[PDB]
Amino acid sequence: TTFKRIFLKRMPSIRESLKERGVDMARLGPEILTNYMDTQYYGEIGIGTPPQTFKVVFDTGSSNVWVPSSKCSRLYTACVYHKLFDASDSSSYKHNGTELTLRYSTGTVSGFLSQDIITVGGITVTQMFGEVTEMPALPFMLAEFDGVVGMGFIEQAIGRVTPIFDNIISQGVLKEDVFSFYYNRDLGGQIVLGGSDPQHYEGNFHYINLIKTGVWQIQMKGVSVGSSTLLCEDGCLALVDTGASYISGSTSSIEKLMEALGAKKRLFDYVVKCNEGPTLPDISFHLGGKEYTLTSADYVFKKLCTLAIHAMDIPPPTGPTWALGATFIRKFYTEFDRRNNRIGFALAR
Amino acid sequence: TTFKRIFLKRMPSIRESLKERGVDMARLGPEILTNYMDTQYYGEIGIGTPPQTFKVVFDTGSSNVWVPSSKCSRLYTACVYHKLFDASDSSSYKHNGTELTLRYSTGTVSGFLSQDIITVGGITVTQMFGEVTEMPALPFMLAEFDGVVGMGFIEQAIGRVTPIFDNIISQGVLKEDVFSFYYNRDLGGQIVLGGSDPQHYEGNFHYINLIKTGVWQIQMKGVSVGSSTLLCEDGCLALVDTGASYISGSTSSIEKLMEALGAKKRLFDYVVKCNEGPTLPDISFHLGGKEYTLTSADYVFKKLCTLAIHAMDIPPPTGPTWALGATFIRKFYTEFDRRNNRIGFALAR
Numbered sequence: 001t002t003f004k005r006i007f008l009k010r011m012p013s014i015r016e017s018l019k020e021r022g023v024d025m026a027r028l029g030p031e032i033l034t035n036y037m038d039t040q041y042y043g044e045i046g047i048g049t050p051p052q053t054f055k056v057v058f059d060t061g062s063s064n065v066w067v068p069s070s071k072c073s074r075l076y077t078a079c080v081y082h083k084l085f086d087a088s089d090s091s092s093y094k095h096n097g098t099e100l101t102l103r104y105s106t107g108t109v110s111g112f113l114s115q116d117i118i119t120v121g122g123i124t125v126t127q128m129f130g131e132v133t134e135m136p137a138l139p140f141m142l143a144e145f146d147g148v149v150g151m152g153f154i155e156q157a158i159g160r161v162t163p164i165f166d167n168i169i170s171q172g173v174l175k176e177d178v179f180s181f182y183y184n185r186d187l188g189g190q191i192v193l194g195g196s197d198p199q200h201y202e203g204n205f206h207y208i209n210l211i212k213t214g215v216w217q218i219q220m221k222g223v224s225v226g227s228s229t230l231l232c233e234d235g236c237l238a239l240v241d242t243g244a245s246y247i248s249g250s251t252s253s254i255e256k257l258m259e260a261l262g263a264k265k266r267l268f269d270y271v272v273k274c275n276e277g278p279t280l281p282d283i284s285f286h287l288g289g290k291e292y293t294l295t296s297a298d299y300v301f302k303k304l305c306t307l308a309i310h311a312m313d314i315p316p317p318t319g320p321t322w323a324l325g326a327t328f329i330r331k332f333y334t335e336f337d338r339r340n341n342r343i344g345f346a347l348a349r
Numbered sequence: 350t351t352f353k354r355i356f357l358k359r360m361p362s363i364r365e366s367l368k369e370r371g372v373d374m375a376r377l378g379p380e381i382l383t384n385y386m387d388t389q390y391y392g393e394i395g396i397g398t399p400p401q402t403f404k405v406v407f408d409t410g411s412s413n414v415w416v417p418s419s420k421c422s423r424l425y426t427a428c429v430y431h432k433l434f435d436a437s438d439s440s441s442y443k444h445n446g447t448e449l450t451l452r453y454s455t456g457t458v459s460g461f462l463s464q465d466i467i468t469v470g471g472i473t474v475t476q477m478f479g480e481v482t483e484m485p486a487l488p489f490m491l492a493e494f495d496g497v498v499g500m501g502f503i504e505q506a507i508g509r510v511t512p513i514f515d516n517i518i519s520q521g522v523l524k525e526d527v528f529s530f531y532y533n534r535d536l537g538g539q540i541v542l543g544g545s546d547p548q549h550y551e552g553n554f555h556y557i558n559l560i561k562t563g564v565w566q567i568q569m570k571g572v573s574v575g576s577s578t579l580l581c582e583d584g585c586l587a588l589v590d591t592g593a594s595y596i597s598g599s600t601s602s603i604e605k606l607m608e609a610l611g612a613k614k615r616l617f618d619y620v621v622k623c624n625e626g627p628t629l630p631d632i633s634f635h636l637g638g639k640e641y642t643l644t645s646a647d648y649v650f651k652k653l654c655t656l657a658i659h660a661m662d663i664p665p666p667t668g669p670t671w672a673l674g675a676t677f678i679r680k681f682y683t684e685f686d687r688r689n690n691r692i693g694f695a696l697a698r
């Protein structure tokens with residue numbers, strides 16, 4: 001049958017556009033967290049009657065929906081350089097006005113709450129979202145996206161606000177209470193609501209139950225370099241985060257990984273010589289029953305060749321954890337199974 | 350012989366990139382002035398030993414040279430999102446440190462003075478320039494250019510600082526003390542230092558002496574719509590401004606022009622129906638001996654078709670004046686004759 005789909009379109013990362021400009025990365029600042037600094041994909045949504053359309057990133061690592069407000073205080077706030085949600089053009093709009101305060105490492109986003117029909121992936125969810133009236137100039141003024149759509153759980157929602165997906169489940173009909181992500185090896189990308197597209201995977205899905213109530217995180221049994229397991233011997237966590245673009249781990253663990261690879265460090269990223277790249281061994285993540293491998297081609301891009309792995313010492317609530325970002329999902333088609341509270345993987349195509 | 354050339358490359362205007370984003374233009378602010386808001390061309394220069402290269406617009410409407418400083422106060426200033434001039438990497442650098450204060454309608458740019466060899470268009474001028482330590486977030490953070498290079502006169506230089514071209518004349522050898530601008534009908538654009546490229550014009554140049562000491566401004570005898578002269582009957586001024594992209598006049602005069610054209614006003618720009626466009630009559634500017642015509646194709650781009658004419662009530666020192674911007678120069682190859690203090694025009698090709 002005909003699916004329910006959100007297409008993902010390529011956009012320049014706010015880091016990328018800085019390189020195009022020619023910015024010195026080291027002279028920036030040291031940079032309740034997801035920068036979207038290297039996020040390179042977005043979909044569109046509608047908000048309200050007539051739908052006011054917005055470019056948004058879909059982030060399984062957070063549980064709020066927010067867009068810029070028409071009530072941004074002119075030039076002062078730096079949100080006025082995106083599309084703004086005018087409530088006076090929506091008949092379905094419903095007032096709320098409870099202040100909301102999302103804190104990021106680069107700055108504090110402020111705004112108020114609002115209710116309205118959201119059109120997404122060919123369907124209408126009545127959502128409660130944030131109307132932002134103050135924005136951090138640093139990342140967001142360079143952004144090509146207008147806002148954020150959480151695909152996380154109520155537990156990680158500021159204000160205990162029901163996430164667009166909960167609302168999708170409870171109100172109205174999806175076939176199955178799941179959703180999947182898929183990236184092309186490259187306008188390339190697709191979310192499906194209520195299914196997995198068979199054309200974009202092969203073989204069979206394999207599942208790992210989420211280890212804790214309200215987050216898309218799972219137990220990882222070991223990280224293997226070449227043929228032998230290096231770190232995560234006694235078990236660590238793996239956060240599947242569609243808002244993140246790369247794989248990340250604790251600095252403790254990331255040091256180890258790169259030493260074995262023989263990738264000398266740049267203070268910005270980890271790099272290898274472009275000749276030596278293809279030689280680099282396979283990395284494999286031990287998740288549930290199966291071993292999920294990433295070849296050199298998958299995580300590599302005369303001496304200037306940067307890798308798709310980074311370090312992120314994530315704070316202790318979600319805990320020390322790894323982060324399977326977009327780079328993993330590009331090779332491994334992923335299904336988020338809210339009905340059974342598990343994540344499932346298959347080879348992409 | 351081999352010329353001395355600065356190639357001009359196309360960049361998205363900070364207005365353009367806002368439209369690509371989808372910004373409401375009316376919800377911005379009302380916007381010692383040239384915004385470069387619709388500027389779409391830049392060249393590169395070097396500054397110092399090893400040349401630190403910068404993307405800059407060449408603006409005959411101003412007489413200062415300035416780039417961003419390595420001493421921008423981190424994230425606070427919003428200049429750190431461009432290339433920065435590090436004085437500690439230049440052997441030719443010479444301290445000055447006299448504060449400089451360029452005022453714009455959107456904000457006040459602050460910085461200090463510095464001396465160094467500038468490499469431009471295949472030659473070295475020792476210049477004194479501005480190192481900017483504070484920048485307006487509004488236009489400049491969206492900019493694709495790093496800085497500005499004045500092609501104006503000492504009179505319109507903040508700090509009475511000698512303009513790169515004066516210095517070019519006095520020190521070292523150009524064949525003739527002139528320079529020309531040329532835009533392709535479209536990476537397209539070229540300045541020549543010390544000559545005019547014969548390949549990019551046809552026929553003979555015709556000249557108009559500058560009417561006052563220190564500005565690229567000239568007497569215009571009349572503005573003709575169709576066959577009959579409408580405004581500037583008793584004579585008005587015409588500022589040839591390479592930093593401006595469009596033609597502009599006093600609002601008094603611009604109202605008149607558009608009424609005769611039958612182009613209904615949008616609060617942002619002046620617009621016409623795309624069917625009706627090609628019908629629009631020829632406009633002709635009466636400068637010196639010859640009549641300089643612009644057909645519909647030259648100033649026009651179902652009902653959405655915006656024109657290349659705008660209104661700018663320029664303050665009374667430079668006076669009520671018109672502004673022949675890049676759109677005029679695209680059809681009419683222009684030579685700036687500093688030796689004889691005149692401007693000369695020819696048909697471009």
Ligand SMILES: *[C@@H]1O[C@H](CO[C@@H]2O[C@@H](C)[C@@H](O)[C@@H](O)[C@@H]2O)[C@@H](O[C@@H]2O[C@H](CO)[C@@H](O[C@@H]3O[C@H](CO)[C@@H](O)[C@H](O)[C@@H]3O)[C@H](O)[C@H]2NC(C)=O)[C@H](O)[C@H]1NC(C)=O
Pocket residue numbers: 095096097098113115128159160
């Ligand atoms: C902004 O919206 C929040 C959240 O609202 C809830 O979801 C919306 C989509 C609608 O369906 C609302 O009807 C719904 O409340 C508002 O806060 C909530 O206020 C209600 C009362 O109006 C609180 O309910 C109470 O529950 C206790 C038992 O636990 C009863 O004893 C009380 O009598 C009462 O019914 C509820 O706790 C509260 N929820 C949260 C998360 O704070 C908020 O009022 C609203 N602000 C506005 C409209 O100005």
Ligand SMILES: *[C@@H]1O[C@H](CO[C@@H]2O[C@@H](C)[C@@H](O)[C@@H](O)[C@@H]2O)[C@@H](O[C@@H]2O[C@H](CO)[C@@H](O[C@@H]3O[C@H](CO)[C@@H](O)[C@H](O)[C@@H]3O)[C@H](O)[C@H]2NC(C)=O)[C@H](O)[C@H]1NC(C)=O
Pocket residue numbers: 444445446447462464477508509
């Ligand atoms: C920053 O630079 C300015 C401008 O400097 C001038 O141009 C430079 C490229 C160099 O060639 C400099 O040598 C040159 O001065 C400085 O200001 C200038 O200071 C000089 C004195 O050092 C002033 O000259 C005076 O002229 C009068 C006569 O009119 C004599 O009686 C005096 O004895 C003296 O010679 C000059 O007026 C002044 N120019 C301006 C525009 O202000 C500035 O000092 C410098 N700051 C530094 C290095 O800290």
